[PDB]
Design a protein around this ligand. Structure first.
Ligand SMILES: [Zn+2]
Lengths: 181, 181
């Protein structure tokens, strides 16, 4: 049985080496996925935050969103008001002022007042679009931030527990492989 | 050699069932946890926002926030424009009109105009407070659902990916078991 005993160990050792070799790839691939997963979170977190203080970035982002919308109000308000004035002074049979209700004594006046308002609104609709794009962009950024708040933990769990734990598994399996060869 | 072999078939089959039975337990305990985990996420999400359709409710809330904010923008702007008019005729001691720039000959006129602008604005504060209130409530609910986005992601991973995969491993393993016994 002596030769047969050694036949037995040799087979047993091969079954050990094969299953370790399996794990090594298995683990290696899990490590690869967890690292990519982390890498992605750090990229999104990076694209989304312009600083190290989250509560502050969010606070400063909120202030910007407030400025833009106040701007939006101005543009939107003036646009509507003047637009109405202009349509009163033209399409309606008013030869008078829309604010002080005073008749325009000469036709020259009427045109210049129309003329003044026409120019005051001259870039207004255009600026209102730009402001709306920036406002939309900011809010979207705000939305993503609020969604990354609750996996602060998860991103940290990968970096400090799971991934180093896996490298440790890969180390132990690598020790087992070298023990056999 | 017939008996010796028949015990042999029996040993292998018993060793298959033992390892299969093991899987059923391991797999079952995995399914038990994923199901609890899913169950808790669903309870939590529903307790925070009472939403049964998440992506659609959130998208619609966002649309409402957009319409309401657009409305208020135009209201506030328009109010600001007229407010400015009034402050021009008063605090700036201007005796001219802001639109047609025509001087006020009498204080009587000027007063009529001042008085005229104020009444146009008399309903403004009430509308502005109402609109900002409705809007504040929508935003808070939107912020809360935004904090639940990754929890909704987990719920979707559990319900559509992880748990059906496990139920399928339990199916095939159960068949493997029933085939031996
Ligand atoms: Zn006037």
């Amino acid at each position: 049985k002596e030769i047969n005993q050694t036949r037995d160990r040799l087979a047993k050792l091969n079954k050990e080496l094969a299953s370790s070799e399996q794990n090594k790839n298995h683990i290696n691939n899990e490590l690869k996925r967890k690292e990519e997963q982390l890498s992605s979170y750090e990229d999104k977190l990076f694209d989304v935050c312009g600083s190290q203080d989250f509560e502050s970035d969010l606070d400063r982002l909120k202030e910007e969103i407030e400025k833009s919308s106040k701007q939006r109000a101005m543009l939107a308000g003036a646009t509507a008001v003047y637009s109405q004035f202009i349509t009163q002074l033209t399409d309606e049979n008013q030869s008078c002022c829309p604010v002080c209700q005073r008749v325009f004594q000469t036709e020259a006046e009427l045109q210049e007042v129309i003329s003044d308002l026409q120019s005051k609104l001259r870039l207004a609709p255009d600026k209102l679009k730009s402001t709306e794009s920036e406002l939309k962009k900011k809010e979207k950024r705000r939305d993503e931030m609020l969604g990354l708040v609750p996996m602060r933990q998860s991103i940290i769990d990968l970096k400090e527990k799971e991934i180093p734990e896996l490298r440790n598994k890969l180390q132990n399996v690598n020790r087992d492989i070298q023990r056999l060869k």
